[PDB]
Design a protein around this ligand. Structure first.
Ligand code: VPM
Ligand code: VPM
Ligand code: ZN
Ligand code: ZN
Lengths: 380, 380
């Protein structure tokens, strides 16, 4: 079976894009939620950014449970690398994450250096990281804008093999800006997989500009990706990172083994919503308030709908099932009829509709008021 | 080049799942928005449901522009078929849409009949539809739960060829409940494509239970799907239908030709939000309020961010670009420095930070108050 690690980047990619970034105590609460959700690793921040972020990464490193990878992001730069290692040093399993651009556009118009020079910068920074962290420590290299490395794709293969030769244990392939379609990205992941083989773990990091981040991450698993970077509530740059809940559930539904505590999803998402001030849309997959409604057919059974029209049960993600029938809720004519059928009581069309009005007259004269089966049986 | 028709089902699949379904005047407004958005076809409702829906389908049929396909949904049943035709009869281009289940589960546990009997029901209803609509009229057949026809997939091929032989011009393949992953569904679309060839148009209809409806619809185009059924604002059953805006933009970005007026997307979505009472989440792709922010780096240029980190411009979908720099907005130290650099005015670190405070003291003493470049230059 495939081993699939869920790597959370809410505290870095998510936090950086927030209108009001989190205080240390809010970060600690989010961290604890990630631990209890049982993600496989946590990126705690970008410690070289400022003193506060640095401190927070130190606190979170020491708080982390034993055996849990703790990543921190750094640019391909010696001083930043050193600062980053200083911040996560005390974690049981620290993981150094270094990023550098690899797309044709980036190399041509942003960095403005030759491809052989990019390879030097990659080798030097990874090699330097290895020299300060020592032999056992995981090093992750991300090629920024990998998703847009269309015209220079072959170069990309050399960049990643260079990073691996210099000491990278994980190759992270970001769809930094979502521009095309899942299978364009996935074909690129597969080709990297084909040259990387078992020399390094392939990790995927996708953004949601065209609403296909989940599908992109999910499909990447099936060409050899073993780590997926995600965020709680789809937080992150612009439209966000790959949504943790959607990806987790999708993979579970396809028969994959994940360590995630799925029953923590809804209470986690609810609290993240409070901490960000961003409401959960009522039609959001998994956690949306209204997604378990089957109200079509009120226009002319519930057990059949719940059976045939649900991917998973609401309790699976830690929600209570609302969807129940009522005697006073409009269409409760069907409910009363079915009840009377069960007890073997014969009543015509007029009597059913008459009983429905009688039930509402007792309901709307009681505070909130619900009509029990026994008393509705008694009303005949 | 691929011809790709965008078929809107907001008035049927979207409306049926709404807490408060739309009145006729609200349906008319939505209809007009779809016409102006320039979708390739519109499903106006399920006219056999009740008298009001029937009337609305008639009104919308007569209102429809010439050359615009107007679909209405019916079950595989003679009387319903007849009623449906009566409702859309007066449209310039009426399209009959008939649905019947084809999944192993449906056949075994819901319908509880043999596979040869399912084929009879499909042949009889389509053949009957053809006999009442006449030769020129488009007939669409949907095999409900096609996405879950895993174990009986080969039967599915016979069901669709049966429907085609009986008179169906369009074969619609729904992912009624999203259960697996895009490429499982897409491989199934491809195999149907392989047996259907040019005998019928392949149409796709996906739901969003696992957040992969957009990717599923998009990827289906690349194995021969020529029609995609979508809804405005991702309305529809449960988590919703394929989002029109995401699919349209994704396909355009992949170099496909669509007839959609992309610059109408944002004002349309805003009005749909008002009519449903469902807010647009600030991180929703395309139309979300906050998706064009590049505020990472305030933690320590805007033109570079907008260039390298945007799939498309906000104006492309009819939004105004907010993202601009200010002299009094915190980090306006960089703005003042850059301004002073431009005018060739030399000022030290303290003077820049001093000028920032001076600017805010004039701003927060003016109603809303903005500091012009000329007056900030004058303050030196
Ligand atoms: C660091 C990298 C994985 C990044 O998150 C970029 C960034 O936000 O620094 C990406 O989406 O490409
Ligand atoms: C009619 C059909 C295309 C359907 O919309 C089912 C329905 O809502 O009647 C689907 O998602 O399978
Ligand atoms: Zn990112
Ligand atoms: Zn549907």
């Amino acid at each position: 079976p495939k081993t699939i690690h869920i790597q959370d980047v809410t505290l870095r990619d998510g936090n950086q894009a927030l209108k009001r970034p989190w205080t240390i105590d809010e970060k600690i609460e989010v961290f604890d939620l990630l631990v209890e959700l049982n993600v496989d690793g946590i990126e705690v921040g970008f410690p070289s950014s400022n003193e506060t972020e640095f401190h927070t990464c130190q606190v979170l490193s020491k708080r982390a449970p034993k055996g849990k990878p703790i990543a921190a992001l750094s640019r391909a730069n010696q001083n930043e690398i050193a600062v980053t290692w200083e911040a996560i040093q005390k974690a049981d399993c620290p993981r150094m994450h270094i990023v550098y651009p690899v797309s044709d556009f980036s190399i041509k118009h942003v960095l403005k250096i030759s491809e052989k020079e990019v390879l030097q910068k990659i080798r030097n920074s990874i090699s330097f990281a290895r020299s300060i962290v020592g032999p056992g420590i995981e090093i992750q290299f991300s090629g920024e804008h990998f998703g847009d490395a269309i015209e220079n794709f072959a170069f990309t293969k050399e960049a990643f093999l260079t990073a691996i030769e210099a000491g990278a244990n994980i190759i992270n392939l970001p769809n930094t800006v979502e521009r095309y379609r899942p299978m364009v990205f996935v074909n690129m992941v597969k080709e990297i997989k084909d040259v990387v083989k078992d020399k390094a773990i392939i990790s995927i990091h996708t953004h949601n500009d065209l609403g296909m981040a989940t599908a992109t991450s999910v499909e990447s698993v099936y060409v050899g990706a073993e780590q997926i970077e995600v965020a709680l509530n789809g937080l992150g740059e612009r439209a966000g990172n790959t949504n943790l809940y959607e990806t987790a559930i999708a993979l579970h539904q396809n028969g994959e083994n994940l360590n995630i505590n799925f029953q923590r999803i809804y209470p986690t998402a609810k609290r993240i919503s409070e901490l960000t001030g961003i409401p959960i849309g009522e039609k959001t997959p998994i956690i949306g308030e209204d997604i378990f409604s089957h109200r079509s057919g009120i226009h002319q059974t519930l057990h059949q709908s719940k059976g045939a029209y649900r991917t998973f049960s609401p309790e699976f993600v830690g929600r209570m099932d609302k969807e129940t029938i009522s005697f006073t809720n409009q269409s409760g004519h069907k409910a009363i009829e079915f009840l009377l059928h069960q007890r073997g009581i014969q009543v015509s069309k007029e009597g059913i509709h008459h009983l429905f009005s009688l039930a509402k007259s007792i309901s709307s004269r009681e505070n909130n008021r619900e009509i029990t089966e026994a008393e509705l049986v008694a009303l005949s």
